[model samples]
Target chain A: RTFESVADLAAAAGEKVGQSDWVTITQEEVNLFADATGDHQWIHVDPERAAAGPFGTTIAHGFMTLALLPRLQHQMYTVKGVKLAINYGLNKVRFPAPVPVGSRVRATSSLVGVEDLGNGTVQATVSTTVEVEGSAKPACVAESIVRYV
Target chain B: RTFESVADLAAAAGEKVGQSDWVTITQEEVNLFADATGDHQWIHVDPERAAAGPFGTTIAHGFMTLALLPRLQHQMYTVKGVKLAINYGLNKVRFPAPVPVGSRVRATSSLVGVEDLGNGTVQATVSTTVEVEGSAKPACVAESIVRYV
Candidate 1:
């Protein structure tokens, strides 16, 4: 379960990684999520009103998109034999495009960098891409750090 | 509000740049924020439970820290003579540290780059440094893309 060597660690991590099931992003999902998050921004709630707004459609909270990580991280990479894979936190995350209701989305995790902290803990930077079914540029891109125990 | 030149945008943006006020992060803050975001991770919610967990204390939700942006941006900068200033969105954001409960945090911002979209709008990047008081590193560093109208 423990990655004893950097070589072994590097070998275990990468683009050939793995992926996850596609997640359907819907308006009902957005509103329920808004209720769950209390971020009832009109842009994410009032579709009729938002149609005239910037994105022209009700959108999901960036947080909601991010919350999908636990379920959507497989499309690109994963860890193995690690007793615990922790969400160390994020370096950066962005919502570049509006994920309109009923859109299908998935994620791919790219291993960007790995470092050995020498304190029995290692740090890995994973760039997770949240892509729409037909979009060119990803809707959300984030650099997440994970620590395995 | 109309930024005819990059120089104009920079000058106006520069005016809004300033430091921030400190706010203590509490366990209640963390819990309420967790309720607001649906992120019920124990490491971030339950103090006694988390005391037996990884970080030994409750931590703020990552998005709670992310949510600080709109407010932090308001405090650190303001657009004058403009009819509106909306969050054009973000290019990137990084959370370098955990905002442990009882931590006091604040932010500072600078104008990183500016662009003239030529569509009566100017795209600007505000680089924000969110410092967790007493920490050697910042809690987050983010690049926000905004447009003025």
Candidate 2:
């Protein structure tokens, strides 16, 4: 879905906006994320060691899963007519399930609220849930804030 | 600082544990993060376009800042005698300031609380603040949870 204006987005408050297609989590991308963040924990980076660890295999970093929000959300919805849309912050984030390497995940998001910040800027709150395929629990649930100017 | 066991870590609850050395945020790493996460927003990727945008230069993704928590905290302290330490989740996260490319940032953390999860497993909560060099406000403040077994 696409919203041409902020008002259109505001009107979507309390509505489920979109559900994205599944994206596979790969060890390659996980390694890249580890390198970028300097988080080389064995559970995330060492498949050999991870095979003997709790999960019995390498799992993607929770932050790596959280970082997929922008890409997942882009596939879900878009708001036009804004010079820039910045990730303002996050309220609460929970990882209920581990995302093992090669697992597929998708996001479903709802517009929570929109607040005018004056000077032609607005802050939008979105509730996003990332579901792991074949899992009863979600991989992550986050309340994210975005600012449009 | 390093804690030899979970008990040592638990005993330090409510105490400010450590501060890490400064780490520079370069455009290269930011771009790598964008590629890894597929968040190619111009504000974070295109320096030329971002120069005319809000922050006058490309800014790192807020998620990128949040992702640095693991590395920054590793520099600050570690807990031994655990077979594995997993990132459980985050309670709340906020980005109070933008981290521009080329900025230097460091983290200070306090052990918030700890709880036993049975079977020799334990959960710990830590509050971390990432400060950008020369900035009055912190780049990120997050309450993160980790599980040890």
Candidate 3:
């Protein structure tokens, strides 16, 4: 979907605007995330060790799930003509399921609220659910705010 | 810094409990995060392109700031003898200021709430502010929930 103006985005509030394509979670991605953050927790990095651990496999870090929001939703919608976009914040976030290695996840987004920040900038609050394929619960659920300027 | 039980933690609700040492944000770290998430936004990767962009320097991704919560605060405090710790969710989050490359950031945590989840599990809410060195506002501010079993 595309919005020609900030007003167009504001008018679309409270609507489930778009859903993204699925992306798989790989152990390599998990290890790369660990490398990026310096958090080499066994459950995320050492697959061999994690195999005998609680989850029976290496699990993606919760932050990794949170950080994937942008990529997951990048194709869901668009606000045309914005010079730039910035992530403003999150009202809430949760991980209700374990995103194991090799699992696929996708995001569904709704425009929950919107505010004109003046000077052609708009703050859009979006509720995003990162659903883990075949899981009863989502891998991540978050209410995120972004500013388009 | 140490809680013997959920009651002990709940009793300290709304209190500031810990502060972490500074950890500097690096361009390499930011680049790695971008790669892992497949969010190669020019503002986060290409310093040359970003130098002409907002903030006049490459800034760490807001989610990158959020993802560092554990690394920034792992030594600040602990719940003694918890069999496992799980990141449950977040309540509110914000990136009030940009974290330019090479800036130092630290997190200060407040124990805001706690609840018994039954079956030897307990959830604790911690309000965290990731302060960017010399900035008027924090790079990231959030309320995070963690479950201990």
Candidate 4:
């Protein structure tokens, strides 16, 4: 859905926005994230060793999963007529389950709140839940804040 | 510093563990991270456009700064004899300032608490502050949780 203006977006407060399409979590992507962040934990980077470890296979880093917010969210909604929109911060985040390599994941988002920061700026709080295919628990849940001017 | 075991690590609760050496946040690194996560936001990936944008220069993604926790923490301390250590989740994360391209940043960590999860697993909560070069406001502050088996 596209919100023509900040006011239109703000009207979505306390309402479900949309859901993103499924994206597979690949080993190549995980390796690239590990290299990018220098977080080459064995469970995240070593497939062979990880097979013998817990979870029975490699998993994506929690931060890597969290980093998917922008990509996943882009597929859900858009706000037009904004000069710029930037990530302001995060209020909270939790990984309730592992996103194993090869597992498909998607996100559902809701607009929790919107605050006018004045001077032509507004901050929106979005609650995102990343769901792992076939899992009872979500891979990640985060309250993300975005500022637009 | 090295903590010989989880017990040793737990004993340091409420104490500052160590500080990491300064690392530059380069455009190349930011671009790579943008690609890795498909964020591709103009403020983070377009240096020329960003030069005229709100921040006056390209800025690193907030998630990119948060992702540096593992890399920065590795420089501070290590826990030996652990079968596996994985990022369990995050309690909270906040970005107070933008990290402009070419800025140097480092982190300081403190062990906030440790809990025995039973079955040879333990969880630890660590508080981290990412300080931008010459900036009074930090780039990011987070409470991260890690599990060891």
DockQ for the candidate 2 complex?
A: 0.80
Estimate, for each residue in A9-68, the C-alpha lDDT of model 1 and write its tens digit: 666666434455687877766665554434566777887777877777777777677766
User: What tens digits encode model 4's per-residue C-alpha lDDT throughout A25-136?
Assistant: 8888888888778899889889899998878899999999999999999899988878777777887888999999999999999999999898768899999999999689
**Residue A44 in model 4: shift from native, Å?**
1.0
lDDT of 1 by residue, B43-109 (tens): 7766777788666787776566765665666656555544334455655666678788889989887
- Per-residue accuracy of model 3 over B12-96 as CA lDDT, tens digit each: 8888888988888898888889888887877788888889987788888888898888776676877765656777888998999
**Residue range B6-27, candidate 2, lDDT tens digits:** 8888888889989999999999
> Candidate 2 chain B — worst ten consecutive residues by lDDT sum?
B114-123
Per-residue lDDT for A91 in model 3? Answer: 85
Per-candidate local distance difference test: 0.66, 0.90, 0.85, 0.90
lDDT of 2 by residue, A18-137 (tens): 999999999999998988899999998898999988899999899989889989988988888889888878888889999999999999999899998987688989999999996899
Query: How close to the true structure is residue B88 of candidate 1, measured as C-alpha lDDT?
Result: 57
What does DockQ give for each predicted structure?
0.20, 0.80, 0.74, 0.75
TM-score for all models, in order of appearance: 0.73, 0.97, 0.93, 0.97
Interface RMSD, all candidates in order, equals 4.8, 1.0, 1.0, 1.2
The alpha-carbon deviation from the true structure for residue A16 of candidate 4, after best TM-score superposition, in angstroms, is 0.3
Each candidate's number of clashing pairs is 10, 0, 0, 0
Q: Rank by DockQ, descending?
A: 2, 4, 3, 1
Model 2 C-alpha lDDT versus the unseen true structure: 0.90
Candidate 1 pairs with clashing backbones = A18-A74, A18-A76, A18-A77, A19-A74, A19-A75, A20-A74, A20-A75, A91-B94, A92-B93, A92-B94
